[model samples]
Target: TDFQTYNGDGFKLQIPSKWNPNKEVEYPGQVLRFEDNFDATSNVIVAITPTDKKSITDFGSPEQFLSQVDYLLAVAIANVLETSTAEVGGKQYYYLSILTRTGGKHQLVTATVNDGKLYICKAQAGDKRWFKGAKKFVENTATSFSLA
Candidate 1:
């Protein structure tokens, strides 16, 4: 697979070459990003949005941006699998797991808003194996980020 571009507010990211498009639906004004397992077990995805807009966050700082997202992922959303906040390149990034209720799939999403732009780093896994790969993918994506 090749990297695809999805524009959101002021942020843009290139999805990995190993993921496949899983779903296409409108969440308010935002076109939610969803990708399935290229191999098996539906590894990764980009699902859920705070609103209909394509933008991920309206704020421009790690403190403000992540705070808004934390409200949605922790308090609002169910199945708080795991939550972590870390700094990269002097900027803060968030990682969260929202597990599937029926025990099928899980979502691993990481996001950061810089200069009014939202950059989402994501991965998915059905089991330990799937998650391990996703973890590596997340790391690669995060490290691969470039503002320009």
Candidate 2:
């Protein structure tokens, strides 16, 4: 059996043990997702789309997307965040800066299409100390995902 599997609704991601369960919210386009608190150090979440798969390019290249994220953060996070680009799962993703005014943290989020399905993995924490775990979390979740 595969280490990771999902039911028809979607796959259950490999969630980090340190994180606490928080509320889940529905986004546009048949997307249901949740957030978690990681060891009191970070937050992580995985979101999958129930709609038909979308073009992967809709999210844009890593640099363009992160630049836009920086602008959005200026207003959304009270001008306290910035963003850069990074590689994950053999794909380029945005490394979002959060809460910059107060020693901002990093967020790794990426949208991708696999076997005609869309998915996104988001992880956040203060600085690089949390990167290793965050990256691993993303990789595991991404690997575990399967269309049901």
Candidate 3:
């Protein structure tokens, strides 16, 4: 349960204590990133972009949004195991769990809209790493992401 709290522009999240912050990786809209020193794929990435909407519900229910998301189209693998919504810190957050066979990984994505911006935080680990206890680590990191 050891973790470090990362406070960025308008959000903060708890990342595993052993993970390191990455500032060199090039990801569109990326504002912050943290990754396991050993497993490159096991990490968390946070990004934000300006938006007109104030809440995520305007996008639709978790299931409804995932159903037609461009992200669902990008990942070659088609398995999406779960989708749900939760109101945390006065914001509705959309969450998704997807299993990718292409790279054999467990991915968790959480999104919310607030302060005229859309925020996304993603946590993931390879299958080998997930069952070895990375699952909870990933879940904790994603769930800790909230507007601040």
Candidate 4:
């Protein structure tokens, strides 16, 4: 499991060697993203966007943040599995896990605030079974996310 550091627009993270960015798919506010060609079902995505909010809580509580974004979550997440918070790299982050409607796989996400900006890191698999195999990779990637 070789890993390398990725420096994005205003963020950074550890990326598994097997994952590569798909340049063809344009993503707004994306800092960096990785997807394994061998298994399109797995992915790591990071985005840093400018925000006036001062804290993650300002955006909303963990559950509210995940649910308030109707346009983004509508028909996307079938159910919320878990929500929590953690202190990582001296910053606080809110985490959310859910069942995705796209493939019925598990999706884990984290959001944080730094320097008046918002950072989002998300990991997802193609199916539920993939969680056992890819959980560590996703957790590592998400936890490694930080402001550059």
Q: For each candidate, C-alpha RMSD in Å? A: 6.5, 6.7, 2.2, 2.5
Model 2: lowest-lDDT 10 consecutive positions: 71-80
Q: Write the per-residue lDDT of candidate 3 for residues 1-148, one digit (tens) a residue.
A: 5888888898989989999888875455788888889877888888787888878888877766556444522356756798878887788999988787655778888889998888888898886686755577789899788889
Pitting candidate 1 against candidate 4, the one with the higher TM-score is 4
Ranking by lDDT: 3, 4, 1, 2
lDDT tens per residue, model 4, 68-147: 54333425446878888877667778888777684576677878888878788887776643655567666677767777
The superposed Cα distance between candidate 4 and the true structure at residue 115, in angstroms, equals 1.7
lDDT of each: 0.48, 0.45, 0.80, 0.73
User: Which candidate number has the best lDDT?
Assistant: 3
**Count of backbone collisions within predicted model 2:** 3
lDDT of 2 by residue, 77-99 (tens): 43324455444455433343334
Tens digit per residue, CA lDDT, model 1, 1-148 = 3455545444455666666655554222233444445444443333334343333333444345545555333123346556666665666666556654344445566665455445554554455444543555444433333333
How do the predictions measure up, each by TM-score?
0.47, 0.47, 0.87, 0.82
How does candidate 4 score on lDDT? 0.73
Off by over 4 Å in 3: 67-74
